[PDB]
Design an enzyme around this catalytic site. Sequence first.
Site, PDB file in Angstrom:
ATOM      1  N   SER B 197     -54.702  39.964 -20.994  1.00 21.10           N
ATOM      2  CA  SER B 197     -55.184  41.334 -21.113  1.00 21.10           C
ATOM      3  C   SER B 197     -56.414  41.587 -20.224  1.00 21.10           C
ATOM      4  CB  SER B 197     -55.507  41.642 -22.574  1.00 21.10           C
ATOM      5  OG  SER B 197     -55.613  43.037 -22.765  1.00 21.10           O
ATOM      6  N   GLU B 324     -46.044  45.431 -25.621  1.00 26.63           N
ATOM      7  CA  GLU B 324     -47.473  45.518 -25.338  1.00 26.63           C
ATOM      8  C   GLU B 324     -48.243  46.630 -26.054  1.00 26.63           C
ATOM      9  OE1 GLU B 324     -48.997  43.282 -23.938  1.00 26.63           O
ATOM     10  OE2 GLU B 324     -47.758  42.271 -22.443  1.00 26.63           O
ATOM     11  N   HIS B 437     -49.004  42.369 -28.299  1.00 26.48           N
ATOM     12  CA  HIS B 437     -49.985  42.135 -27.253  1.00 26.48           C
ATOM     13  C   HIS B 437     -50.850  40.947 -27.679  1.00 26.48           C
ATOM     14  CE1 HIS B 437     -52.781  43.440 -24.032  1.00 26.48           C
ATOM     15  NE2 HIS B 437     -53.752  43.192 -24.892  1.00 26.48           N
TER      16      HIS B 437
END
Lengths: 532, 528
Positions: B197, B324, B437
Site C-alpha cells: 500500500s 482492494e 487490502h
Amino acid sequence: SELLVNTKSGKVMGTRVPVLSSHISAFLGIPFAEPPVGNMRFRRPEPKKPWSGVWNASTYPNNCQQYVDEQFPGFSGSEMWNPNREMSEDCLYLNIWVPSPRPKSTTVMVWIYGGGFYSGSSTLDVYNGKYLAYTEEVVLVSLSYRVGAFGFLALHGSQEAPGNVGLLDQRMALQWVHDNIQFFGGDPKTVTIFGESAGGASVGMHILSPGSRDLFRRAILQSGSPNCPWASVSVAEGRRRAVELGRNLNCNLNSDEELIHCLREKKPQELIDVEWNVLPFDSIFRFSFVPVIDGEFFPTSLESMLNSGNFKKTQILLGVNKDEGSFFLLYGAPGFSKDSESKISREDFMSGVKLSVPHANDLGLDAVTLQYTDWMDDNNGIKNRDGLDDIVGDHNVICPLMHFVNKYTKFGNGTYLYFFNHRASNLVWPEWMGVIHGYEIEFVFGLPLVKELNYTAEEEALSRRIMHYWATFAKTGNPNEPHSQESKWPLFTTKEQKFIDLNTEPMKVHQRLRVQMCVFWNQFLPKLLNAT
Amino acid sequence: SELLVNTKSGKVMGTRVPVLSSHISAFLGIPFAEPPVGNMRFRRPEPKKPWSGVWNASTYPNNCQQYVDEQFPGFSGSEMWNPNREMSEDCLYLNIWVPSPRPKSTTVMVWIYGGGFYSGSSTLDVYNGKYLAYTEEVVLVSLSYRVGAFGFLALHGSQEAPGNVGLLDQRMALQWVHDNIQFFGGDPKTVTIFGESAGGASVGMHILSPGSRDLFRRAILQSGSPNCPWASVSVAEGRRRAVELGRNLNCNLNSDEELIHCLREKKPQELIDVEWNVLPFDSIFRFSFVPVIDGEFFPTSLESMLNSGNFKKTQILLGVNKDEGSFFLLYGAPGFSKDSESKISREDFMSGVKLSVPHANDLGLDAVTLQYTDWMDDNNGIKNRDGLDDIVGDHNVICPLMHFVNKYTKFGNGTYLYFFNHRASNLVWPEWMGVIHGYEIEFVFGLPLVKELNYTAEEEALSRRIMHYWATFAKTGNPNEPSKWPLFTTKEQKFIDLNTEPMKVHQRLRVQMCVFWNQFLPKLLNAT
Ligand SMILES: *[C@@H]1O[C@H](CO)[C@@H](O)[C@H](O)[C@H]1NC(C)=O
Ligand SMILES: *[C@@H]1O[C@H](CO)[C@@H](O)[C@H](O)[C@H]1NC(C)=O
Ligand SMILES: *[C@@H]1O[C@H](CO)[C@@H](O)[C@H](O)[C@H]1NC(C)=O
Ligand SMILES: *[C@@H]1O[C@H](CO)[C@@H](O)[C@H](O)[C@H]1NC(C)=O
C-alpha cells in the site's frame, strides 16, 4: 360494379388480381394530389382537382424522382429496393387492395415506404399488398410521397419551399383515405398507419404533428422513429444544405426566390447528381434532405413534445431487427464486402466509428470506441465487425426507438414492442449481415406464403402470425386475439418494459431491449457532447 | 559474540529469538536518525549521532505519532494495524532479523510499512520478520518513517517544513543499511526494498527519485505504486492543507515561519485530532499529508518521469489483491457494515461513487456510474456492493499500478506481475469484503507457518511458495528457481494468480476497466 368506385374526386376502375388461388380487387395508381411539377416543385401539395370519366386504376403509377442504387448491378438484394417503374415528379398516387367481396367497414392499413427520405417507391414487389389484404381481410392502402430535395428541400421563411412537403404529401394521402376509403369498404375511423425505417419515422411524425393526428386511429413503427438522428434537421442545417445544393449547381444565391427559381429550372436528375454533396461530414446513415423542425408541422422540438405528452395518445406496435446497421456498413465503411466475412482490422474499426457518429467530437469518439471494444481481444476481426455493426444499429435505430417507446408509453394507451431476429432461409446477402434492415417487411407482407418464392414451411407460419398480429392490432389495438389460445404478446409498460422476439421459435418474453447500450446512446453520450 | 555487532554508529546487542522450533538473531529498535523532536519537527532527518557503549537492541522501539483506529474496539481485524507500542515522535528506528549462524554476504530485504502515509508501524505482528528471514535465509530489515503531518506537512520554499521528510526518513534508513548491513552478514549490493500500500508506493517513489536509486538493487511493490491518486499532491495543495491545519489550530498564518513555530508548540495529538479536516472533499481512500511533487525528491511530474524513462532500471515484482476497496467502503461509505452482507441500495451506490471519485465533475460521475452498473438489474444490492467495491479498488490500486507496470516495463530490466485472490480460511472480516487490502501480507511474512494461527495446510504451502518467490526474486531478479511465473512484457502482458490452486497464467490484468480509469476518465476530466 365491384371494380367501379365513385370517389369524391371522380370515378375509378380497378382490376381483379389473383392471390393465392383466390382473387381480390386492386385500385392502382389513384392520384390524390396535383402533379407537383414546374412552379409546383418544392411547394406544399395541392388536392387533385376532380376529373371527368373513369380513371383507369389497373396499373402501378410512376415512382418519384430519386437516387438509384447501382452499387451491385443485377443483384436482387439491392435491386429489389430500386424503382421498378419509370420515375417522374408526377408521382403522388396511392394504391388500394380490397377484399372480394367488398367488406362493409373493415379495418384499413396504410403503408408508408421507407428509404431514408431520399428514396423509396410504393410499387416494389415486397410491398405487393394482395397477400396481407387477402389473408387478414383488411383494406390495404399504399401511399407515396416526394423524396430527396423534391420532397424536403427546406428554406424556412419561404412559402415556395417551406420544407416537410414530403410529410404533407403523406398527410394528403391520409386525408384522402379519410374521405374516400368508405367507398372501397374501408372504415375511416379504424385506420392504422405503418411504415419501416424512414416510413416508421414518418408514422411517429404523424403521431406527433397536430395536423396529422386526427387522420388515423393507430400506428405501427418498423425499424424507425421520429427522433432518429438521421430523420430530421434544424431549419438552420436545412437552409444551409438548401443553399449548398444551389452552390453545387451554380445558382444565384442572393435570395430564396432566385435560388429556388434556379432550382426549379433544373431537370430532376441534375438535383440528384449532387444530392449527396451537401452533407456536413463524411458519414453513413445520413441523408441530405429530410424533415425539418420548422415550428409548424412540429410545434416544438421533438424531445419537448415527447416530454410534455404533446402527441396523439393511442396504441402503438413497434420494433426493430437484430442487425439494423450492416446494410449501411457494407455501402460506406472500409473493410466490408458482401463477398467475404468482412473481418475488420482495428484501423478500419476506428474509421468505422468516426463514420458512424459523424457529429461526435474526439471525446465522444473515444467514448463510443471504449463502449464497443473488448480490450482483451481488440484485434479480433469478427468482434470489430459486429461491434461496428451494433454501433450503427444502436445509434441510428434501436436506441432512438427505445427512447421513443419509453417516452410515449408514459402517455400512450398501449404499447407492443418486438425484436425481429430471424435470418431468412433464402437470403441472398452474406451471413455476416445477419437480420438485415428492411427484411422483416417481406414477412409483414406475406411473401413467405407464395410457394414459388421458396421460403420454408416455418417461415410461412412466422409470416402468418406476424400478419395476424399486425392486422389484429390494426382492428383492436391489441395484437393478441381476446382469450384466444396461443402465447400472449405482453404489453410494454414503463415498469416491466417487456417485449417479444419475432422468429420461427416459440414466443420468448424479454425485458429492457438493449438498455446498457441505449443508456449510453440516450443519456451519457448526449451529456458528453453537450458539455464539449 | 554473534549478537554483538559493531556498526559505524556504535555497538549493538541483539537477542536470540525462537522461530519454528529453532532460532535466529534479532536486533530490534536500532536508531538510524536523530529523534525528530522539538525544533526538528517537520525537518529533514539528521543521521543518528554515534553513541558510546552498547545499545540495547532487544526490544521493539516506539511507533510514530499517528491517528489510531477505534471503529471496532477489541476487533482483531482492525486492531492488528494499530500501534502496538507507545507512540512517540522519537520513532526513527529500524529492526533486523539475521539467520543463525550469521550468513556471509547474503541477500537483504527491507520492509516499508503502508498505512496511507498517515499511519503504520514496523513493530506489527504481521511484519514479524523472523519467519521469512529463517525460512528463506535472508537478512530482513523493517524500517520506520514519520507519518501524518509529522512526516509530510509541506510548505514548499521553506527549509523548516519542505515536505517529503517521511520519504527521506525511509532513505536515511536505506543509507544506514547500505553502510552497516554488511556487519550483520547483509550484502549492501543485493538489497531489495518491498512494501504494501503506502509502502508499495514508497518503493516506487524511491525507484523514481535520483537520490534513492543507488541505495537498493531491486524492488517489490504490493498493492501500491507511486502514481496512485492518493499517494501524492502538488506543492499548492500541500501548502493549502498545511495552512488549513494551522487555521484549525488557531495558528498565526502571516508567514511560513510563524505558522511553523505554532505547529511545533502543539502536542502531537492536537495535530492528529484535526488531521482529517484539511481534506478538500468528503471522500474515501484520501489522506491529508502525503508526498509532494516538489521538483527535488521528484525532479518533475511522476508521469513525465515515467514517460522519459527517468528512473532506476532494474527488476520489479508487483501485484494487487482481488478486493482492494472493501476496507475503505466499510469505513466511509453508506450502506456498508462489518456484520452484514451490505447490499447497497441505488441511493447509497450513487453517493458511494461520489465519495470514491471526489475530484470528478458530474459527467465524470455519470461515466463511472455507467461503467459499473448492470442496467438489466440496477436494483441488485449485491451487484451494487461489488460494483462500488471494484470502483474503489480499480481507481486507487489496480489501475494506477497497471499504468505503472506498463510504463516501467518499457525501460525496466524485468517485470513480474501477480494477482493475489485467496480469501484466508481463518479471516475475521465478513465474506463480502473478499480478499482484503493488506491481507496478502501475512503470507509474505509466513504467518501461515505457525501452527497455532490455525491456517490450512494449503495456505502454509501458499505462504511458502510466496516467500520463496519474494526471496528468490530478491536474490536473483527472477522469482523462478532454475510452473514458471512468466515475465511480464509489453506485448504479452502476462501475470499469474496467487492462490492455493495450481498456477494459471493470464494476460492484461483488468484491462477493460483500466483503459477507462487510465485513459478515458482522465481525458474526460481534462476536457470537462
Ligand atoms: C386500363 O389499362 C389496362 C392496361 O393497358 C387495359 O388492359 C385496360 O383495358 C384499360 N381499361 C380501359 C377499358 O381503358
Ligand atoms: C386506455 O384508455 C382507457 C380509457 O381511458 C382505459 O380504460 C384503459 O385502461 C387504457 N389502457 C391502457 C393500456 O392504458
Ligand atoms: C535490554 O532492555 C530490556 C528491556 O527492559 C531488558 O529486559 C534487558 O535486560 C536489557 N538487556 C540488558 C541485560 O542490558
Ligand atoms: C536486462 O539487461 C541485460 C543487460 O543489458 C539484457 O541483456 C537483458 O535482455 C535485459 N533483460 C530484460 C528482461 O530486459
